[PDB]
Design a protein around this ligand. Structure first.
Ligand SMILES: CCCCCCCC/C=C\CCCCCCCC(=O)O[C@@H](COC(=O)CCCCCCCCCCCCCCC)COP(=O)([O-])OCC[N+](C)(C)C
Ligand SMILES: CCCCCCCC/C=C\CCCCCCCC(=O)O[C@@H](COC(=O)CCCCCCCCCCCCCCC)COP(=O)([O-])OCC[N+](C)(C)C
Ligand SMILES: CCCCCCCC/C=C\CCCCCCCC(=O)O[C@@H](COC(=O)CCCCCCCCCCCCCCC)COP(=O)([O-])OCC[N+](C)(C)C
Ligand SMILES: CCCCCCCC/C=C\CCCCCCCC(=O)O[C@@H](COC(=O)CCCCCCCCCCCCCCC)COP(=O)([O-])OCC[N+](C)(C)C
Ligand SMILES: CCCCCCCC/C=C\CCCCCCCC(=O)O[C@@H](COC(=O)CCCCCCCCCCCCCCC)COP(=O)([O-])OCC[N+](C)(C)C
Ligand code: NA
Lengths: 656, 656, 115
């Protein structure tokens, strides 16, 4: 979006527009940047000769105070590794030779910035970045600590952009930057503690998830370097370590939205002998096209919180969702729930809520409308032993079940779901106000304010408008509720803005040309008030009003000019762009409507699972226990899938 | 669609979560799976030493009872050929060495499952599947019967998916799996009986049809392996053997819908000397572009039942039909019938049925409408010697010819044709009810119930609506009847569902705001009843009613709010999506309308052929007799086709 | 280059960097530090900004017969120097015109309609 702002840059080439201490520092920092090799041995010989004319037991502290910048913590060796020259291999040798003779060596190698913006960045981070593996091998031989954590403002941005975040450790920098050979050069060195956490709490595997691309692209160098480090560890320690916000690297993969690393993590099978337990897919038999598989689902099903099925559905800012739902343990565990408990509970809602409106409509439409007997037609009003009184009791007790439950569902809703049609925020607002106006019509009848009938008529209106919610069961009618809502909130709300300006504008312009015919008693014009003349232009938009242009008004030609100017501007011009602008939109819905429906069916599957007791939820608890190795008890989900179109491709290529 | 369910898997690697007999069996079945070669010779030496401490003449039965699983019939050698190792070549030698010393050998080789799900699967089937031709040559040298039929639940699925079906024989498994070299290795072995039938009755050639793809694709390994086996046989025995359901492999090719094998089978020409009779296309002379050909049509024309011209037209679930009709003996034998008997009989129906409605309309419209003389205007009612009485007799006798014949055509109609526009199921339902209401109007006039005129008016309505059927003769008007029926049953029936909810909803909502003006005697509102207020909203949809909003009703502002809320919801919003959703549909018809018309003309060609006597059908019997070889009498169809655009391509490449 | 409309030579002339020793001054783009993806740059803008007449930002906007304009506005010293002006003085002055001219018509309409 917008570029960031950093105060001091990391290394500057351009000069911007005591002295003996100023004489000697800058001549070292400049000469190390172009790499004059003779100039290094001149200054450093005089520098140790300078420090002899200084108090002992404070001579190493004065020595580094020459070598260091004052405002930033950068030393001499850091600028050398930044500014690459052919003369680097000589001056690195001398800067290691000068550190040997004194006690400065351990202080010199592990130097970091003390600057607030770039803190912690050691010399070993700089050698890895510039594609210099051989200076990196010497700094390891010099004894640089490989657990160096560079916590800083620049190394921890608050957004995705405005910074660079890799994991604050030299092993994560090696793997994110497409550098294979440095990784085994660091991992086979036994002093490297792999399992260690940064300021965010991430280990090595969380970082590689955050540097991927969700699209399937040409090269996937964050995917293969994820794999090389995992097998070399050979344990479940890197997989199940959980960060500060309580996510594992599979649960983080669904959170960020990376839809290609996540396809790998489900479908791992390693079939060699010592590396057997790392697999999450187990194939037990195959025969031609047919193959059976046992998926793991230890953290996929909803038996625990923050499951990777719950994260995909209920969370937006995940841009691509439907490409994640079509994965194999995710597609089956929605479809297997649909045939067992979920298709009947959606049917029982449509039976009661359609029998709720028939009981509401007949009560209001056949009510006593005479003043001599005006009961409330609901809630019995009296004691008459009237027929069908299992109905009027049924309206009121179901009106509280809708009011309270959606009133809970209003509150427990994040601000992310308010701004998208993909989320069902809009239906909890329309079912709720239908429950309010019913119980208010009993509440306003009782206190005798006597506006009760207006709220009950609006209750019968929205009571049949919300029957369009239950069309999301079919596929042929499920697209027709989505395609309406992609037309209203996109385009039609841009139409009713501009059309008001032409309605408001000519509304006063025609009202000012008449003198009041209510003084004339004839009511000759229908354009008397502003509220009348606006209405007579609305009938001229649909085609309902009549051009009674024989008019006893001041300047009747100008009154006839503006009516023709109105019809050209808004009947042929604006209303036939709205057909031409909806035509772009409806074709853009029809290609991708089948994806949006399967999401909005997969939201009411997981809601009806949460409305279950614990025994009945565990009655439909899918999966069995398995023993796939020595000392192992895992969960399984047998899928006997068959692949005709893929098997013919594999067997055809093998001969030729 | 949905995956299948099988009880016991074929071979399991994963353990699920007397003892001396339990001690020795599992140590054989495990050691044969990883292939420790020393462990085999330890157990089998002790096993024959174990059987000596057992009753003689029951020693081989006890021996196999160790080697076999109890619940399934799988033996030791089957798990070896499944679990491929580098140590298979040793343990196959020893398992053949151990079978030699006893009388177990013939029992050991031909072992099958006795399991219900996987019955009949021998060891020779398993060696072919794992791409192991060399173990297959040894098992033939061991003496495995090649006629092994594996009838089973898994080897015979009821659908296309949920199983694997290849033909239940090791020759069909060799050919379906893209394995050329094993085929001649089985066919040149003289013990292989090629002509043999499975549970479905199929021979070798029926199976290869059922494993193809109807699309023309990159590789066609089921097409070439069909050809290699046919010439090596060199006889008409494999072609004309007919299965249990009475189809030949050409008639089965049209039934399943495979449209690429079928193109090959028509156009075969083999021009070598001993292989001459197998061809179905005969070229006698050619000269540049022009070439003449004699097609075979022994089982193509409709002179016998289940002809391959009758199967394509009258049967659906064949997805692609029009790509099959454009083949060369199928395209000519429809077009040659169109110029001889079929274009006149379609003309004679349009002449009579248009002269049937003029006689019907003039009789009803110029009837005696006075009460002083009210005859039935048809069927003479009297004896007056009235003029033009060759007309009223003509209506009634033709009304029975329509009623009975379509009433036969109602019954003899499969449930497959009821669910598609491609089938003419809908026209037999509308011509039939037009014949009923005419003969009922004479039947209801006679018994003096006196509702006769209502049925006769509906008879005049559908009598001109069915004249849209006879537009299928032209091409310019033939698309316009198809494009109507792809708009009604797709989209408009989804419109009249949602529009009812907005009509039903505001119908009660506006009816509840008025007190009954029939008590006021003025009839001031047109919104009195529910049946009135729904009608006044229907006129506001087209543009016919008038917004008489000056209304003496309770809360007149809310009555004015809902009318504007109705017009926005359904005149600008819903009715202009229906134009925008028909626009997707009509362009999707216009590209493929020319294909759907040629099918619906090719249905009334074969119907008018069935309405012929035997002499007049044999009068137009196409084709002559031929003698294309020694002792041969076949049918022929000479086509002198010319190919300019193909001949220029062939002759241009030949120089360069 | 902006006058005639040539939109490919102009992309080169902005983004020249020569890093050899005697040929240093000819560059109009200066890179001072980079680290992985992040890179900083100093553009020249001696004749790009509107501090003088016939600037190459004024020629692109106010002159037609330049067929392709929007491919020229997306260049890097031209895209930033429009967006940086939008957050400092330009978005408020467009807001003050919409406030006065909408309060100009309400004062006009009420005066004529209630006359
Ligand atoms: C009464 C409970 C709440 C009242 C209520 O509002 O009901 C609600 C649920 O309606 C239901 O169908 C579930 C209610 C029963 C809960 C217990 C399940 C019993 C298990 C049975 C297992 C048998 C199956 C096995 C068959 C072999 C209906 O309200 P709604 O329509 O959901 O609200 C609109 C939708 N919205 C939430 C998005 C806005
Ligand atoms: C498909 C939809 C599009 C079709 C629209 C086609 C365009 C319009 C089509 C037809 C317009 C109607 C023509 C009839 C004229 C009325 C009669 C009349 O009064 O005569 C008057 C002259 O005529 C006028 O000057 C009338 C004033 C406006 C008429 C149109 C002018 C331009 C409209 C806006 C231009 C575009 C604005 C927007 C730009 C995009 C003189 O009257 P009189 O001398 O006093 O005596 C006559 C007696 N009488 C009054 C009883 C008769
Ligand atoms: C009377 C017989 C049945 C009555 C009848 O319904 O007629 C039917 C056939 O109408 C015909 O044209 C065929 C009737 C004659 C049958 C004998 C053929 C004579 C050979 C002559 C050779 C001379 C040619 C050679 C010239 C050189 C007309 O009914 P329909 O319109 O088909 O019904 C609607 C269509 N639908 C069936 C799909 C619903
Ligand atoms: C191209 C098609 C689209 C264009 C449509 C554009 C939108 C509509 C365009 C124009 C609407 C017509 C305006 C005229 C008002 C009537 C006069 C009146 O009664 O004044 C009343 C105020 O006004 C009202 O409140 C009337 C009630 C509803 C009017 C519209 C409200 C929102 C409609 C639904 C919103 C969207 C719902 C669906 C969401 C998608 C007050 O009356 P009074 O104080 O008692 O005294 C006046 C005396 N008299 C009554 C005799 C006059
Ligand atoms: C009075 C001056 C002219 C009158 C006038 O017409 O105004 C005009 C400018 O309206 C303005 O907003 C600018 C007027 C102030 C000029 C001095 C700027 C003060 C700096 C403030 C810095 C504070 C921001 C910093 C905040 C931290 C409005 O007229 P218009 O709408 O432009 O005319 C239609 C458009 N058209 C020109 C294309 C046709
Ligand atoms: Na119209």
């Amino acid at each position: 979006t917008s570029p960031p702002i950093f105060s001091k840059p990391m290394d500057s080439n351009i000069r911007q527009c005591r002295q003996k201490k100023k004489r000697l520092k800058k001549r070292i920092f400049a000469a190390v940047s172009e790499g004059c090799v003779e100039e290094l041995r001149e200054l450093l010989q005089d520098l140790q000769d300078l420090c002899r004319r200084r108090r002992g037991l404070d001579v190493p502290d004065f020595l580094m105070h020459k070598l260091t910048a004052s405002d930033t913590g950068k030393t001499c060796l850091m600028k050398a590794l930044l500014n690459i020259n052919p003369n680097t291999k000589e001056i690195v040798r001398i800067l290691l030779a000068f550190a040997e003779e004194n006690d400065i060596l351990d202080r010199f190698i592990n130097a970091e910035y003390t600057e607030e913006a770039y803190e912690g960045q050691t010399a070993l981070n700089i050698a890895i970045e510039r594609r210099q593996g051989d200076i990196t091998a010497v700094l390891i031989a010099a004894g640089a600590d490989v657990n160096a954590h560079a916590k800083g403002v620049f190394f921890n941005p608050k957004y995705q952009h405005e910074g660079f975040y890799f994991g604050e450790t030299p092993l994560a920098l090696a793997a994110c930057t497409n550098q294979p050979e440095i990784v085994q050069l660091l991992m086979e060195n036994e002093q490297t503690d792999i399992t260690s956490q940064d300021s965010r709490g991430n280990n090595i595997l969380h970082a590689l998830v955050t540097v991927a691309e969700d699209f399937k692209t040409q090269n996937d160098f964050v995917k293969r370097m994820y794999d090389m480090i995992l097998l070399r560890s050979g344990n479940w320690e890197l997989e199940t370590m959980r960060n500060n916000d309580g996510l594992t690297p599979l649960q983080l993969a669904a959170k960020m939205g990376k839809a290609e690393i996540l396809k790998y993590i489900l479908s791992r099978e390693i079939k060699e002998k010592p590396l057997r337990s790392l697999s999450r897919k187990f194939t037990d038999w195959a025969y031609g096209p047919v193959s059976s598989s046992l998926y793991d689902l230890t953290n996929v099903d909803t038996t625990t919180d923050n499951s990777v099925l719950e994260i995909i559905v209920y969370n937006t800012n995940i841009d691509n969702r439907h490409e994640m739902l079509t994965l194999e343990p995710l597609h089956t565990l929605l479809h297997t729930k649909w045939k067992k408990f979920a298709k009947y509970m959606f049917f029982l809602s449509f039976c009661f809520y359609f029998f709720y409106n028939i009981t509401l409509t007949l009560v209001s439409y056949y009510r006593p409308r005479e003043d001599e007997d005006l009961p409330h037609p609901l809630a019995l009003t009296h004691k008459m032993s009237w027929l069908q009184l299992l109905g009027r009791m049924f309206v009121l007790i179901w009106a509280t079940c809708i009011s309270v439950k959606e009133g809970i569902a209003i509150f427990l809703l994040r601000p992310s779901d308010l701004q998208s049609i993909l989320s069902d925020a809009w239906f909890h607002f329309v079912f709720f106000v239908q429950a309010v106006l019913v119980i208010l019509s009993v509440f306003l009848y009782l206190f005798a304010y006597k506006e009760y009938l207006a709220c009950l008529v609006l209750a019968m209106a929205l009571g049949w408008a919300n029957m369009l919610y239950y069309t999301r069961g079919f596929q042929s009618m499920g697209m027709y509720s989505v395609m309406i809502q992609k037309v209203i909130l996109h385009d039609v709300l841009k139409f009713l803005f501009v059309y008001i300006l032409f309605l408001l504008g000519f509304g006063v312009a025609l009202a000012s040309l008449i003198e009041k015919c209510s003084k004339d008693k004839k009511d000759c014009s229908s354009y008397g008030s502003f509220s009348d003349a606006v209405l007579e232009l609305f009938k001229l938009t649909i085609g309902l009003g009549d051009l009674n242009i024989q008019q006893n008004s001041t300047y009747p030609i100008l009154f006839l000019f503006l009516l023709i100017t109105y019809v050209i501007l808004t009947f042929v011009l604006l209303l036939n762009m709205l057909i031409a602008l909806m035509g772009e939109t409806v074709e853009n819905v029809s290609k991708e409507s089948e994806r949006i429906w399967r999401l909005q069916r997969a939201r009411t599957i997981l809601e009806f699972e949460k409305m279950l007791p614990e025994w009945l939820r565990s009655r439909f608890r899918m999966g069995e226990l398995c023993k796939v190795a020595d000392e192992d008890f895992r969960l399984c989900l047998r899928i006997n899938e068959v692949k005709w179109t893929e098997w013919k491709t594999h067997v055809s290529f093998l001969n030729e």
